[PDB]
Amino acid sequence: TXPGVTXPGV
């Protein structure tokens, strides 16, 4: 995720 907690996605 995120970053943080990429995206999703990317």
PDB file of N, CA, C and O in Angstrom:
ATOM      1  N   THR A   1       0.852  -1.174   0.000  1.00  0.00           N
ATOM      2  CA  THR A   1       0.000   0.000   0.000  1.00  0.00           C
ATOM      3  C   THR A   1       0.907   1.249   0.000  1.00  0.00           C
ATOM      4  O   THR A   1       2.081   1.188   0.375  1.00  0.00           O
ATOM      5  N   UNK A   2       0.267   2.376  -0.347  1.00  0.00           N
ATOM      6  CA  UNK A   2       0.780   3.714   0.002  1.00  0.00           C
ATOM      7  C   UNK A   2       1.721   4.211  -1.103  1.00  0.00           C
ATOM      8  O   UNK A   2       1.285   4.453  -2.235  1.00  0.00           O
ATOM      9  N   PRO A   3       3.018   4.422  -0.800  1.00  0.00           N
ATOM     10  CA  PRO A   3       3.737   3.945   0.394  1.00  0.00           C
ATOM     11  C   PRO A   3       3.516   4.861   1.582  1.00  0.00           C
ATOM     12  O   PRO A   3       3.546   6.092   1.400  1.00  0.00           O
ATOM     13  N   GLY A   4       3.382   4.340   2.812  1.00  0.00           N
ATOM     14  CA  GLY A   4       3.331   2.927   3.161  1.00  0.00           C
ATOM     15  C   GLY A   4       1.920   2.484   3.594  1.00  0.00           C
ATOM     16  O   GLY A   4       0.952   3.195   3.385  1.00  0.00           O
ATOM     17  N   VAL A   5       1.821   1.282   4.200  1.00  0.00           N
ATOM     18  CA  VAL A   5       0.471   0.851   4.643  1.00  0.00           C
ATOM     19  C   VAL A   5      -0.527   0.876   3.481  1.00  0.00           C
ATOM     20  O   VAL A   5      -1.653   1.291   3.551  1.00  0.00           O
ATOM     21  N   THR A   6       3.201   0.255  -3.126  1.00  0.00           N
ATOM     22  CA  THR A   6       2.420   1.432  -3.470  1.00  0.00           C
ATOM     23  C   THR A   6       0.925   1.106  -3.593  1.00  0.00           C
ATOM     24  O   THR A   6       0.517  -0.042  -3.780  1.00  0.00           O
ATOM     25  N   UNK A   7       0.143   2.181  -3.574  1.00  0.00           N
ATOM     26  CA  UNK A   7      -1.253   2.164  -4.008  1.00  0.00           C
ATOM     27  C   UNK A   7      -2.127   1.530  -2.926  1.00  0.00           C
ATOM     28  O   UNK A   7      -2.227   2.050  -1.806  1.00  0.00           O
ATOM     29  N   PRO A   8      -2.857   0.425  -3.235  1.00  0.00           N
ATOM     30  CA  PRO A   8      -2.594  -0.475  -4.386  1.00  0.00           C
ATOM     31  C   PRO A   8      -3.242   0.019  -5.662  1.00  0.00           C
ATOM     32  O   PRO A   8      -4.300   0.647  -5.610  1.00  0.00           O
ATOM     33  N   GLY A   9      -2.699  -0.351  -6.829  1.00  0.00           N
ATOM     34  CA  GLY A   9      -1.375  -0.929  -6.972  1.00  0.00           C
ATOM     35  C   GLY A   9      -0.309   0.139  -7.273  1.00  0.00           C
ATOM     36  O   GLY A   9      -0.601   1.327  -7.241  1.00  0.00           O
ATOM     37  N   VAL A  10       0.925  -0.294  -7.597  1.00  0.00           N
ATOM     38  CA  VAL A  10       1.908   0.707  -8.056  1.00  0.00           C
ATOM     39  C   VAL A  10       2.125   1.798  -7.038  1.00  0.00           C
ATOM     40  O   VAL A  10       2.165   2.983  -7.246  1.00  0.00           O
TER      41      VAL A  10
END
